[PDB]
Amino acid sequence: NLTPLFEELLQQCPPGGQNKTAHMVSAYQLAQGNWMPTSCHVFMGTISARRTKTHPYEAYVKLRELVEEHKMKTLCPGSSLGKHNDWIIGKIKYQGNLRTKHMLNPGKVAEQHNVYNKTIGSVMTATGIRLEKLPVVRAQTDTTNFHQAIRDKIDKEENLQTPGLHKKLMEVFNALKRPELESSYDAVEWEELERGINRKGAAGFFERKNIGEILDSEKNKVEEIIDNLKKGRNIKYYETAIPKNEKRDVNDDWTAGDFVDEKKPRVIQYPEAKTRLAITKVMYKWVKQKPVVIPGYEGKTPLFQIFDKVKKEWDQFQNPVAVSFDTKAWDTQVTTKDLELIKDIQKYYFKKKWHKFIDTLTMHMTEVPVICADGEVYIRKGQRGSGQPDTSAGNSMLNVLTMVYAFCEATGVPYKSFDRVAKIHVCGDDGFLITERALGEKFASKGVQILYEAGKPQKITEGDKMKVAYQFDDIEFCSHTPIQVRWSDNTSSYMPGRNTTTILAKMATRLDSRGTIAYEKAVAFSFLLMYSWNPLIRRICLLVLSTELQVKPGKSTTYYYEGDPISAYKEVIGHNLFDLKRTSFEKLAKLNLSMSVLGAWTRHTSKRLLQDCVNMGVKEGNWLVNADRLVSSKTGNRYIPGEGHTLQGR
């Protein structure tokens, strides 16, 4: 009768190991009665008890008491600052006001805009879209709330994990390794590194130069860092903490969409540019996943291809479901033991000569001095700094390993049999697995407690059950969800869907210090490659791309086109924009609801936007807008593309 109160309490219990020498009882058995708990240390949702004719509610107060004693005995031990971190105390000037209760705040070192895209935003307002009703995106955070986010998210002890967990995860990894690559990775040349790197990658708190300036002038400083790490010598490793969307919140690398920024923590933490180059030059093959050795890693997968790729798998099951990975604030849940596990996997693939390098870097990452923009210093215990070069690889491998383990331990499938039973996909902590429905439902109901014990608590959901998709287009991944379209050649395919209100908001605004038609047409094109299923988005893009046919698109955003944008679309999408005859009617109604709830459009909006495209397309000539099938069928005019190619930006 009171079994949900016990499932709750078992998620506040310290994770323990298998006690095969006493009775290990589930939350169900406890809600029955005549079971008296003898310790609060939980293992696969079970604790140690002895039958002793006790009332069920009596046994709850005892578990609650054992939990409350255990917490007031592991409070907050003042931890020894490692010697290799001592230098930061030598930079302290004033005393701290972070008021951290779980990490050292050893003081404070000396002190050291959302705007509209004018053309895109005009096209929206002309057809009656109310911009001030759209959701705000890319919000900045002041210093008072910045320090509060530190206190809320970062200022915590390392998660307790199941004893022996990381040996199991290494067992899972042994079922997934690629032995033809073992001990084979070496550092890359400067030239290869310089190809794939944003030269405006941010400088650390004590750095003045950005990535490109350091490449042009201080390569010796980077090789000096590499040398010291190679031999096992400490470096002055620190990370800098800035709020999301700050000036220094810059991606070293091309991102597959704005969803990567959306998923960043509120507190961004990154090593120095010199230090980031050092790690990247040596660990390139691992951090960039070249080749991909993480199963199901979609980090390199274009957003316009991902769901077609997944549907292929979904079709091979006889009753597939998809179970979502939904860890709470993943980066704050990464433990020292997690990092050492990833250190061990890296050592598998890297040549022996880099193992001391990896050991020493990993040691620096387990206790990280972090300097805030305003000078406040805290000493982070474990966790992931979002700007670390290893964030995508290191999180993706840890996510895969932890999710396979949790799935296998809930269902009974041996680790070496996971690949005959389920398919997995990850982007850092984001992802899901597809499997047959009964396995999927099993995993979904037991995964929450197994994942809490493995140190990755899940977001608190309706009945402590992991989210299950029972139809393909209910999957969520990379902030998007599948939507089917119909082409004029009697085929169908999937595109990345999301709320129309969200797309408008992201398309309409930017953070700027770059505000010009060149940038906006690059945005319009980048969005057309993803959202051409959405007729409102499709037509705003065509209108924007019709502006100043002689100005070329900018290269600072996700994609751009060389030559004809309509032909560039067909190059990567595989059909002509003109061949899209139908978007799935049910899914589109779902993704359009918030337009009506927020009042971001009116009953005329679609008509006015269609009427604007028609008015432009009837005129004699060659008009981009006539690539829209319904516009062309009303103007009587077709568009004849010239040559054109899609490319990545920066």
Residue numbers in the entry: 13 to 124, 132 to 532, 536 to 672
Authors' text:
Compared to the RdRPs of other Flaviviridae representatives such as the NS5 of the Japanese encephalitis virus (JEV) and dengue virus (DENV) in the Flavivirus genus and the NS5B of the hepatitis C virus (HCV) of the Hepacivirus genus, the pestivirus NS5B contains a unique ∼90-residue N-terminal domain (NTD) that does not have notable sequence homology to any other viral or host proteins. The global conformation of our CSFV NS5B structures is consistent with the recently reported CSFV structure with an RMSD value of 0.9 Å (95% coverage) between the reported structure and our representative C-682 structure. These structures together reveal that the NTD adopts a globular α/β fold with an α-β-α-β-β-α pattern. The NTD interacts with the palm of the RdRP core intra-molecularly with a mixture of hydrophobic and hydrogen bonding interactions. Collectively, these biochemical data indicated that the RNA synthesis fidelity of CSFV NS5B is fine-tuned by its NTD through the intra-molecular interactions with the RdRP palm.
